[PDB]
Write a structure and sequence with these properties.
The complex is a heterodimer of chains A (116) and B (104).
Chain A (H helix, E strand, L loop, with lengths): L1 H14 L3 E3 L8 E3 L8 E2 L8 H9 L1 H18 L3 E3 L6 H11 L4 H4 L2 E3 L2
Parallel strand pairs in A: 4-5
Antiparallel strand pairs in A: 1-2, 2-3
Helix pairs in contact in A: 3-4
Chain B lengths: L1 E6 L2 E5 L1 H12 L7 H12 L5 E3 L5 H19 L4 H16 L6
Parallel strand pairs in B: 1-3
Antiparallel strand pairs in B: 1-2
Helix pairs in contact in B: 3-4
The chains are: A alpha+beta (116), B alpha+beta (104).
Protein name (chain B): Immunity protein CdiI
Organism (chain B): Burkholderia pseudomallei (Pseudomonas pseudomallei)
Subunit structure (chain B): Specifically interacts with cognate toxin CdiA, which inhibits the toxin.
């Protein structure tokens, strides 16, 4: 919850309106309940809940990159936005992530948001 | 927000709530002798902090066991009031496991 909760709060400043956790059994994470993006869906990734978790993500990012990116494309295809709270990534891994994102189809790249 | 990776090309995309729901139930249903299978599959989450687990490295026997373990978890969940909200994703997961080339 806290990782995604924080990400949603920040996203609200840039996308407007309010972001609500989707109802139980939804295939998406959050849905905009108001504002100019009202009704649009949001799936989060890379929103670690703890310092420990962020460290784990960082240490093995390269090992997990392919599965992470495939999961990312799946969710970018299905949801309106896929925001990544990537601030915690090492510069080494940010380079990996940005490069990998640039090799996805452009229609998916437009859907991916890097929370600065 | 996450997935269950079956093999490199075959995945079950899930929301964060679905991911947590599934990994917790499946995780409770492993036999003592099969705990190493869980550890291998759960590695991306437990070692790597990822919101996915993966059966891509298991042989036919390991995956057969994982599927049996998934069906046990699914049974143990039928009792629960939430079950209909999750039934479609249990079905997706069991189906993709069944269709895996290693089980042919």
């Amino acid at each position: 919850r806290p990782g995604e909760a924080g990400a949603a709060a920040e996203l609200e400043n840039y996308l407007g309106g309010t972001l609500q956790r989707a109802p139980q059994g939804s295939s998406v994470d959050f849905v905009f309940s108001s504002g100019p993006n009202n009704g649009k869906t949001v799936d989060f990734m890379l929103t670690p809940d703890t310092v420990a978790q962020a460290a784990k993500i960082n240490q093995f990012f390269d090992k997990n990159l392919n599965n992470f990116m495939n999961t990312l494309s799946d969710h970018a295809a299905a949801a309106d936005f896929v925001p990544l709270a990537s601030r915690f990534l090492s510069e080494a891994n940010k380079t990996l992530l940005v490069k990998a994102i640039g090799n996805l189809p452009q229609k998916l790249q437009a859907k991916i948001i890097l929370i600065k | 927000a996450g997935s269950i990776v079956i093999s490199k090309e075959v995945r079950v995309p899930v929301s964060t709530s679905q991911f947590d729901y599934l990994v917790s139930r499946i995780g409770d249903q492993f036999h003592s002798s099969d705990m190493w299978i869980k550890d291998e599959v759960y590695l991306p989450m437990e070692e790597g902090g990822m919101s996915f687990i993966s059966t891509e490295s298991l042989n036919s026997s390991g995956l057969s066991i994982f599927l049996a373990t998934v069906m046990r978890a699914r049974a143990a969940s039928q009792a629960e009031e939430s079950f209909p909200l999750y039934e479609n994703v249990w079905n997706q997961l069991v189906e993709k496991l069944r269709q895996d080339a290693r089980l042919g």
